[PDB]
Amino acid sequence: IVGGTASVRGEWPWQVTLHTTSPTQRHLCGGSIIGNQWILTAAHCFYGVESPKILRVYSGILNQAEIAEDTSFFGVQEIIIHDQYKMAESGYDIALLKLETTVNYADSQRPISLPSKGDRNVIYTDCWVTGWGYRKLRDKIQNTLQKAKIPLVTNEECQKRYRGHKITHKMICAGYREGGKDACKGDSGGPLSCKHNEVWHLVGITSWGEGCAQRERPGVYTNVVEYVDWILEKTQAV
Template identity: 45%
Template sequence: CVGKFRCSSSRCISSTAQCDGHVDCEHGEDELSCVRVSGKSSVLQVLSEGVWSTVCSEDWDPELGFSACKQLGYSRSGSEVLRGVRGRLFLKLEKLLLHFFLLLIDTVSVRSCSVWSAQCGSRPQFSTRIVGGNLSLEGQFPWQVSLQFQNEHLCGGSIVATRWILTAAHCVYGFAFPQVWTVLVGLTEQPVSVSGAKYLSVEKIIYHARYRPKGLDYDIALLKLVEPLAFNGLVEPICLPNFGEEFEDGKMCWISGWGRLRMGVSLHSARVPLISAKACSQPEVYQGYISPGMICAGYLEGGTDSCQGDSGGPLACEDSSVWKLVGATSWGQGCAERNKPGVYTRITQALTWIHQQMEVRKKYGD
């Protein structure tokens, strides 16, 4: 299928047939992932004739925004069925793209997906900035969840939509049975000490098909909840980054979790800088192990790091008062050791997979 699109049945179709409004693959995967939000400016783009093109903002309305959000896997409720880019959205975008207007969408339109996915990346019940401390307060990381395996904390995770939790594949690989898992939201201490904390049942667990337990790449998984979450300030989603969005080396971000859990322990957090792939690949650090799908964060001198029990939890960065999920805690040598910073799954490299899982399961009612 060199130069072509491969269907799940291994059938090859022309790349220009992808996202043309006509289903050519048996399972319709050629009409998935046809919309993306790209770059730091959050430009909406659609795939047309094998090329990603920027959408003109003229004649934009909420219905088109809603259709675009549904194509990304978001919707107002979990029961709605995705219609894809066909219909009015496809026809109108196609007409606009013929004019090749490379205009940015109005800010309100750009944030449509955030609005319909419950205005991600905000902390409405937290205003205090912690300096030099590591105990987290209620509402400081409202997207943080605890993944409970047979009622015991095993890993962390992040809320990315009303029914979706993002975590690490190594947390669930080998025992991806929904009935033995629960998701605990809205808490800072374990055992649960606040009335707002809730246990939620899991409907489905999906880990990346290319993840292998002896490997370190593709360490990402999604948990679909049985019922959608109600966002209330203590429980909020974190934004996914945009396609192609870059986060500069040295940017200060936050990690959080219940690593090395003990009875009565609180949610801990730490402020850590992002480390360049070049620095993280030095011979004395992780030479040969850092792939494009990974991002490092922490201090080469050691002292602050994620640890066992933090796996799958968020590496969150604030960008213009909006919090984005830059990484998911994946691996590291020891905890807080010199020249052994934390390594995280790079979310920007996994966006296509994330949106595909959310979209295809909405489209086919899975």
């Protein structure tokens, strides 16, 4: 996260840090708890990932330092990538992680509600992006979860900033005309939370952007509401 500040512990209870153990353990992506056995994250986070066995999901984390060899985690039973996903910039950058065990909810770890189709008209004015990603272009994974309040921009406005891309209605952008605050590498899979009517909604999933926090270069996110049917279908037992 660029231009953000340190989060208060437990302030974003749905935020998880997804680690890979190969070659050695490290933070791979952010993710959001949306069900007792489900994490919603970005598809491009699993590039080169041949098996869910090298993945570890850590919930209720503020500082990466809390994570040690003796720290408990949730194993991943299955990685579900949208069948139309090819790459972040083309859309469909969404994936579900089915955990091997269930998450016991508490003040430090709870699910974030998904947006409703009837809210596609709502005008979220209190949106925040969070993660342990880069604080700059040439940076590295941060210890403390960062947060930044960022205003959403219309898709038409976003399209103007990315003339070489197709900003579809399945994408949503957020950023300041002058830049300064934005998600960055490492924040991928992270949630773009917006508080509406005293309730937090998972509006977007950190997906991509040209650089980080540059002027006239809004961050691009997966428009979650456009995938509620997909999520319902993929999360139903088999």
